[PDB]
Write a protein that binds this ligand. Structure first.
Ligand SMILES: COc1ccc(N2CCN(Cc3cc(=O)oc4c(O)c(O)ccc34)CC2)cc1
Ligand SMILES: [Fe+3]
Ligand SMILES: [Fe+3]
Ligand SMILES: [Fe+3]
Ligand SMILES: [Fe+3]
Ligand SMILES: [O-]
Lengths: 264, 264
């Protein structure tokens, strides 16, 4: 019901009051569809670096893991629900950024060269969205305290500003950098799980937030485990797709068609 | 068929020779669905400016018409199909931006203050995709000469900065600035559909690009005029949404639910 009599109205400001809040509309329409026993076997992989650049990217992720695992106390304590959600909550705020700068820079190339994209731009922009929905789900489990709330703001500034020039300078490095970051998302999200399953972790959020059920389409009775599993799936998807793009780049196949448009 | 055996593969670089170039995987699957006898009726409007900001927006958008008209000789000549296409082309290189720098920032804020964004980002993104898919369409109706190929780049610089900084200081000034450009746009495109009737201009490209056929889901019979008629209604979807956004800034409503997620 979107035709000219609507299109000719100047503003719809008076309709903000009457329209509802529906969890459904937080996301774009591009929802992940996983079936749990299938993705139940997603498993940790490690792609060989090739040049300097991969090796460079690869040190960057490992130099960063070793910082972040000490400063976030993560090791010195028996694992809990709490210290995990804080880890991820924090981790997903950078997980937004490259997904975005990604398309936003590919997008401006397309507009300025007057050329095709062949379906990269929307693939990335949803990698940005999915990583933001992770965050909108984790926020529901725990609001962070002023400490973290602040460190996010600095981090983001720093990260944004690395990632935009690292893209302009070397897309191959960034896709490669990200690919390596997700091998670590997969590692951890399987730890978390091994933990639940053995019992070393006992979860109290067996409710799964409204946003999280609709986004992922889960059962009304989906567990804390269930939710990690799909997030763990989502993290594997991105692992491939970037290491893919980095290879693609590596071989000057970076105006080729994005293979994953087909591969649905 | 996306599952745990494709998630566990390091790469897909070798699938990129076997994988088709199809015009329906350029855009996302978020394409307008107009019906032409209806969107035939779209009108020319004006929204009154309130403050300095609303007034200032209107001065720059007007002054930029005046200059680009006098610098593109739109006055001294005939309404030849040349400088109609050659015009939209250039101009969709800049329409591709506000949406992308707006969606970028709200994503970044959503992330960094962990707050729900309520259907703005995606709306704001597809606005830009849409505009790009005008330029893509036009690119097949006429390929531009180097002069204009440059003019375009040295312009994405000015405008990717301007819009970047304005949208921080005053997204309202931009969501109005855009709102007043679309006005001049939805004019210029009724100017051209008028002139195809009056018969002052006879469109020689009454083939419509396969890109812009899938996207707008037109016929194979559909004239140039019909293509204009849809593009024009897209531009009018924009005109009002951006004003509604500007107004939602004016009334401290920047974090209310997008009133177009429903009105879909
Ligand atoms: C200063 O900014 C940074 C600080 C640390 C990092 N890293 C810490 C953890 N990260 C891997 C990671 C581990 C994980 O257990 O979950 C993740 C996760 O859920 C993501 O979405 C992205 C990365 C990770 C490696 C580098 C990156 C940027
Ligand atoms: Fe993540
Ligand atoms: Fe991630
Ligand atoms: Fe336009
Ligand atoms: Fe426009
Ligand atoms: O435009």
């Amino acid at each position: 019901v979107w035709g000219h009599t609507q299109l000719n109205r100047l503003s719809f400001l008076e309709t903000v009051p009457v329209v509802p809040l529906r969890v459904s509309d937080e996301s774009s329409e591009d929802r992940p569809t996983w079936s749990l026993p299938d993705i139940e076997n997603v498993a940790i992989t490690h792609k060989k670096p090739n040049g300097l650049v991969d090796t460079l990217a690869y040190r960057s992720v490992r130099t960063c893991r070793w910082l972040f695992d000490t400063f976030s106390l993560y090791r010195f304590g028996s694992i809990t629900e709490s210290k995990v959600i804080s880890r991820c909550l924090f981790l997903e705020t950078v997980a937004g950024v490259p997904g975005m700068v990604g398309g936003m820079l590919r997008h401006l190339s397309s507009l300025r060269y007057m050329t095709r994209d062949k379906g990269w731009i929307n693939t990335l922009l949803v990698e940005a969205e999915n990583e933001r929905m992770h965050l909108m789900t984790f926020i529901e489990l725990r609001q962070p305290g002023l400490p973290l709330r602040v460190s996010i703001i600095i981090t983001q500034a720093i990260m944004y500003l690395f990632l935009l020039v690292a893209y302009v300078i070397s897309p191959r490095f960034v896709h490669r950098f990200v690919g390596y970051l997700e091998e670590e998302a997969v590692i951890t999200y399987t730890g978390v799980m091994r933990a639940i399953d053995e019992g070393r972790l006992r979860p109290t959020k067996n409710d799964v937030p409204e946003v999280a059920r609709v986004y992922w389409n889960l059962s009304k009775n989906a567990t804390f485990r269930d939710l990690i599993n799909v997030i763990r799936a989502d993290e594997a998807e991105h692992r491939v797709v970037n290491h893919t793009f980095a290879d693609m780049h590596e071989k000057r196949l970076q105006n080729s068609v994005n293979p994953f448009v087909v591969l649905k």
